[PDB]
RNA sequence: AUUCCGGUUGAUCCUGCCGGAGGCCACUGCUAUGGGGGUCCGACUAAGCCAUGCGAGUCAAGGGGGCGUCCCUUCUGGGACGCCACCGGCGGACGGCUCAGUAACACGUCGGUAACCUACCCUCGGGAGGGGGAUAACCCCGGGAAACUGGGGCUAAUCCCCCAUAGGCCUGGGGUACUGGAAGGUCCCCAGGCCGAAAGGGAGCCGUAAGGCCCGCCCGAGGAUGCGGCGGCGGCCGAUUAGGUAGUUGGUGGGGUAACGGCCCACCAAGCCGAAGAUCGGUACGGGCCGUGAGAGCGGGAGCCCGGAGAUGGACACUGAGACACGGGUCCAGGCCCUACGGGGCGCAGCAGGCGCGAAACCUCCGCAAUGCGGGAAACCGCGACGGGGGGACCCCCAGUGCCGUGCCUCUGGCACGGCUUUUCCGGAGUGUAAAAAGCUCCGGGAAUAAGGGCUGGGCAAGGCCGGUGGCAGCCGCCGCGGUAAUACCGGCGGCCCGAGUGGUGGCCACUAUUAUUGGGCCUAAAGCGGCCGUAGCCGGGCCCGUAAGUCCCUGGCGAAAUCCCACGGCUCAACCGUGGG
């Protein structure tokens, strides 16, 4: 039987979100732990070799990553197992090419191209708030990152809010709160890749999460859980959202 | 997981009536073995199964599959372009047998005889849409039916080849 | 199965059929039991010994 | 006769990837040297910095696909390319 | 092997066979049996995932905490009563909840010495 | 696609069973399987034994030595490359292999962990002070047949250690801000005690030095990878196994665990399970799926993916973040290999192969590459993972073994003449090897060069004459044939089915409304009890008021992939694969 951690991943076992030819070869690059969850990310090696076609074989992708000619949210990352998740900005300054990873209507992930001025803003979903000794508030984001603020600024934030972050230097720009009427992009569920406006809340006790009701651009009404309601704007989207 | 046979054996393979019907469908179209004929029956069969499944089926996806069924049947050239889901039932084995490439080449007059057409096909002297197909059992779409010509490098493409004029006069005669 | 013949035995058919059918008593290597084994084919038992 | 369908430029690698079709109706499939010599002509490339990946000749077809690769410097070619493809085209003994 | 594994008999009493051998994670350690003495003797134990557990084998001093909240690091004379087991009070063995006699008086222990390594108590 | 037919009588109807007729899986005869393209092979026996080679490493940018060479300078000595092995960081707990064990919270799904852990990863806040010590390699020296191994000098590390403070832990009192429905925890103060950090670094640019880039060390807090244990429901057979359990069930209070928990201990009490099948026995890895069938349904779990478990049987421990650890260690049992006999060491349910078993399953091959893993930031390295190839009537798709005109017959098929393609072979050129081959792809000379297996009385309609045998030899799935004229035996000829296949046996579903819910029978053939009563259970009068458990409709999450169906696209179409839909 198994006596410790897994170090491989059979291709057939790959997550459902990856555009990968499942019957090509046996294995797949097991992602290493990182910002996002297993469900909602992909190794950048597939992004380079496959989604961009820049490298055909893997060896040349090792080399191009070693040259550090990429900027994932304003940081060169040579770790080919790095997981690139939702709302992260892939930037190639050499070609001036900027894309943002977004989920598709089918639930897979895709690179939406974006302009340069958009490239340094990133929205972080405030996953939780934890106090650290010395009374320093710490916001844990949806992408395995943390930021520190003061006690007097704790009222400003709440869990599940969105924070548009100047990622290349880690500076808070604005905070999109939650109340009725916010523009929202859905991350998971059969309502994936849906953009609409918040209508109503649904409080359920007993560990049953909160459910929002979203109206679509034309007015169709549907429902989805809290944690999938990624707020991007209060009235209109602040980013080019397919 | 195993790859299963695509055709079906007769339930009783020694009925005189069915045996003779198979024989008279064999001699005319000149197929090699009963595998081919049973296969050609089989695609008809599951077309009918699809028709029956979708006729009773409700819901939008049923409509989508129905439209795709009609569309591909038309694209095959098996049905008139204004057909409905009804007349698909009344198809016959012969209807598919005309759509065989081997039949089509004979009906284009390029061959005096069935087996001659088959031999030319397997010998790669017949091209479709600029591409050579070596399977006389290949099924031809409607849209392709006018692109069937001699293979360009083949001598039979040459009008003066010693095997062209008897074909030609047989077509004329 | 694979076995060793130990003896040739003929058998009278069942009436109203009449005739003599040859066979051999065979000890079986797999488990050791002894069982009769009919020999088919006309003029064939000569080739079993 | 060679006719191109698409030429792409990997600025990250500094490389030109080109896909082309060889019409050779009634002709044997051409070698690597001849296709290289013809291809380098109209594209204005240094033949020593250009290599050909594959020339796939399909069944029952007179059009054979070909995929070729052109660098801008010797050392990127030496550092990125596997050795065996260079050996095939003769750029390494 | 001190095995803190599964029970071997069903709630109905059906005797369960062992389907698999014992694993490293499902076994405990020996009972510490803290005892009174003139000095404090301690031992560090490597545990699951590289953590450490400190274990006391001799006890000499205690932390008696006032109802107000102050603390006093005093010496231990003897154990008065051990409600957990009668054998332990006789043998001068200290565990949580034991009532012990010190220079201040009677103190009920509210710390586990086998894991904390220190004895904390509340006077009565 | 919802099919029947032969067999009980002098003749008929019925019941009932058997045989034919189809597919899948094993074994096997004959016959070739020529050609190609996508897939399988100790799957039920010995989880029996095994010679053998290979299958697991990488880093000298952490460290310090030695050896060789180059170059320059040579008292010295620097730098370049390679080797040596060591310290040491990481890996060797994943991957490969099998189904013995297990009737189990082993498994499937749905929830809870607030009752846990987490090395390599990401991010926010902070830190790297002082001091000390260690011995390999090498030089002197030895045993034994060996394994293996002694002793003196000797050296540095991010090797080891002490202290400094953060910080880790536990408790009493007092407040309060936060996740959250809440809990308790988290936040802060006071109080008491225990434990208790690091590591800098090779090269290079600028810089006199420093200082900026690169890699790396440590604390707090999360996230995330992997995991642990908790629960509801689901899913075999035996009643010629009816009572079972002894910490066995719960309560008090504690030990032990990373963690809750009788898990364990002490005391208390008598509980827990059973006819809705306890206990005991037989039997078996569970699931996605697979074979057959019109479908209800019936069966099966080997190849692929998930979870489970195991290394000759058993038992046990170190190091580790992770093991009681296939190619680490110790003992017993049992088997075996080497030896001046003091003692040693072995272990293919890894790849390839042998012995054994048996009806029954392959080459002691080539590369580290395409994919992917560990290491090294980088080059790259290794891998019997994997990828290629090798043998095999393993599965599915395609394909022919001649075509045409004339004349004669056996006019159905063949025969003779004339012409025609060259299904192979030979040569050249592409992929491709991450090398040749892979015969794949295009061109040139060119045979017309690969067709057999079964059946021929009827059920199966399915195909008829002549010789030999003469109740013998013989034939047969069932009925049935043969004692002189055999359309049923053997031979010849003829003919019929299928076709690179065909035949025989065994196993499974259909046939079978011969398991019957859909949907079977019990007056005379199998079967309504020799009678009545009545408990659980099952079925239950009408109307009115209420609930809304069942029932139905809408909507959130979820039930992985591969597989099933469909359109389009790619390999010549197809098998296979991709995108989209179900």
UniProtKB/Swiss-Prot annotation, chain A:
The keyword Transmembrane helix does not apply. One of its GO terms (molecular function) is structural constituent of ribosome. InterPro entries: KOW, Rib_uL2_dom2, Ribosomal_eS4, Ribosomal_eS4_central_region, Ribosomal_eS4_central_sf, Ribosomal_eS4_KOW, Ribosomal_eS4_N, Ribosomal_eS4_N_CS. GO terms for biological process: translation. Keywords: Ribonucleoprotein, Ribosomal protein, RNA-binding, rRNA-binding. It comes from the Archaea. CDD domains: KOW_RPS4, S4. GO terms for cellular component: cytosolic small ribosomal subunit. Residues 42-104 form the S4 RNA-binding domain. The keyword RNA-binding applies. PROSITE patterns: RIBOSOMAL_S4E (PS00528), S4 (PS50889). Belongs to the eukaryotic ribosomal protein eS4 family. Part of the 30S ribosomal subunit. This is Small ribosomal subunit protein eS4. It comes from Pyrococcus furiosus (strain ATCC 43587 / DSM 3638 / JCM 8422 / Vc1).
From Swiss-Prot, chain B:
It holds the Pfam family S4. It comes from the Archaea. SUPFAM superfamilies: Alpha-L RNA-binding motif. One of its GO terms (cellular component) is small ribosomal subunit. PROSITE patterns: RIBOSOMAL_S4 (PS00632), S4 (PS50889). Residues 99-170 form the S4 RNA-binding domain. This is Small ribosomal subunit protein uS4.
Curated annotation (Swiss-Prot), chain C:
It comes from the Archaea. With S4 and S5 plays an important role in translational accuracy. Located at the interface of the 30S and 50S subunits. Part of the 30S ribosomal subunit. Belongs to the universal ribosomal protein uS12 family. This is Small ribosomal subunit protein uS12. It comes from Pyrococcus furiosus (strain ATCC 43587 / DSM 3638 / JCM 8422 / Vc1). The gene is rps12. The chain holds residues 50 to 98 of 147 of the full protein.
Swiss-Prot record, chain D:
SUPFAM superfamilies: Ribosomal proteins S24e, L23 and L15e (SSF54189). Pfam families: Ribosomal_S24e (PF01282). GO terms for cellular component: ribonucleoprotein complex; ribosome. Disulfide bonds: none annotated. The keyword RNA-binding applies. Keywords: Ribonucleoprotein, Ribosomal protein, RNA-binding, rRNA-binding. InterPro entries: Nucleotide-bd_a/b_plait_sf, Ribosomal_eS24, Ribosomal_eS24_CS, Ribosomal_uL23/eL15/eS24_sf. Gene3D superfamilies: 3.30.70.330. GO terms for biological process: translation. Belongs to the eukaryotic ribosomal protein eS24 family. This is Small ribosomal subunit protein eS24. It comes from Pyrococcus furiosus (strain ATCC 43587 / DSM 3638 / JCM 8422 / Vc1). The gene is rps24e.
């Amino acid at each position: 039987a198994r006596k410790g951690p897994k170090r491989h991943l059979k291709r057939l076992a790959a997550p459902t979100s990856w555009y990968i030819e499942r019957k090509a070869y046996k294995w797949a690059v097991r992602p290493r732990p990182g910002p996002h969850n297993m469900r909602t990310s992909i190794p950048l090696l597939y992004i380079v070799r496959d989604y961009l076609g820049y490298a055909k074989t893997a060896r040349e992708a090792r080399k191009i990553l070693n040259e550090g000619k990429f900027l994932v949210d304003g940081r060169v990352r040579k770790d080919y197992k790095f997981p690139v998740g939702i709302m992260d900005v892939v930037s190639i300054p050499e070609t001036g090419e900027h894309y943002r990873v977004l989920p598709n209507r089918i639930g897979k992930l895709i690179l939406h191209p974006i302009s340069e001025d958009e490239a340094f803003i990133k929205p972080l979903r405030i996953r939780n708030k934890r106090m650290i000794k010395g009374a320093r508030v710490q916001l844990n984001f949806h992408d395995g990152t943390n930021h520190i603020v003061s006690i007097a600024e704790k009222d400003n934030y709440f869990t599940s809010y969105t924070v548009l972050m100047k990622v290349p230097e880690r500076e808070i720009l604005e905070v999109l709160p939650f109340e009725k009427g916010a523009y929202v992009f859905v991350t998971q569920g059969k309502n994936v890749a849906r953009k609409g406006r918040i209508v109503e809340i649904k409080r359920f006790p007993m560990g049953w999460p909160d459910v929002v009701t979203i109206e679509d651009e034309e007015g169709e009404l549907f429902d989805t859980l809290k944690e999938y309601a990624f707020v991007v704007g209060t009235d209109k989207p602040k980013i080019s959202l397919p | 997981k195993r790859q299963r046979k695509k055709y079906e054996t007769p339930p009783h393979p020694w009925i005189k009536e069915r045996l003779d019907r198979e024989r008279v469908l064999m001699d005319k179209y000149e197929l090699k073995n009963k595998k081919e004929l049973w296969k050609h029956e089989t695609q008809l069969k599951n077309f009918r199964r699809r028709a029956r499944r979708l006729l009773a089926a409700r819901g939008k996806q049923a409509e989508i599959e129905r439209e795709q069924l009609l569309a591909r049947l038309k694209r095959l050239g098996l049905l008139p372009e204004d057909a409905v889901l009804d007349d698909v039932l009344s198809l016959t084995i012969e209807d598919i047998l005309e759509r065989r490439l081997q039949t089509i080449v004979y009906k284009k007059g390029l061959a005096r005889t069935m087996r001659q057409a088959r031999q030319l096909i397997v010998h790669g002297h017949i091209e479709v849409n600029g591409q050579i197909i070596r399977s006389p059992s290949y099924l031809v779409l409607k849209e392709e039916e006018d692109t069937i010509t001699y293979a360009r490098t083949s001598p039979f493409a040459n009008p003066q080849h010693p095997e062209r004029m008897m074909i030609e006069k047989a077509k004329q005669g | 199965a694979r076995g060793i013949v130990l003896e040739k035995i003929a058998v009278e058919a069942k009436q109203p059929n009449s005739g003599m059918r040859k066979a051999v008593r065979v000890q079986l290597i797999k488990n050791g039991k002894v069982v009769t084994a009919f020999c088919p084919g006309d003029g064939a038992i000569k080739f079993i010994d | 006769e060679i006719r191109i369908k698409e030429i792409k430029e990997n600025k990250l690698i500094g490389r030109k990837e080109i896909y082309f079709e060889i019409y050779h109706p009634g002709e044997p499939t051409p070698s690597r040297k001849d296709v290289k010599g013809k291809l380098v002509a109209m594209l204005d490339l240094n033949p020593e910095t250009t290599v050909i990946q594959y020339i796939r000749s399909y069944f029952g077809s007179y059009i054979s696909k070909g995929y070729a690769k052109a660098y801008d410097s010797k050392e990127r070619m030496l550092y990125i390319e596997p050795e065996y493809i260079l050996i095939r085209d003769g750029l390494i003994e | 092997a001190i095995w803190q594994g599964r029970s071997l008999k069903k709630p109905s009493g059906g005797r369960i066979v062992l389907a698999r051998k014992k694993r490293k994670r499902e076994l405990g350690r020996e009972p510490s049996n803290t005892r009174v003495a003139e000095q404090d003797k301690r031992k560090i134990i490597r545990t699951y995932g590289g953590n450490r557990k400190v274990r006391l084998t001799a006890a000499a001093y205690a932390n008696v905490f006032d109802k107000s909240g102050k603390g006093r690091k005093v010496r231990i004379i003897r154990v008065i009563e051990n409600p957990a087991n009668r054998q332990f009070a006789r043998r001068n063995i200290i565990t949580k909840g034991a009532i012990i006699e010190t220079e201040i008086g009677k103190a009920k222990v509210t710390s586990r010495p086998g894991q904390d390594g220190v004895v904390n108590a509340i006077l009565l």
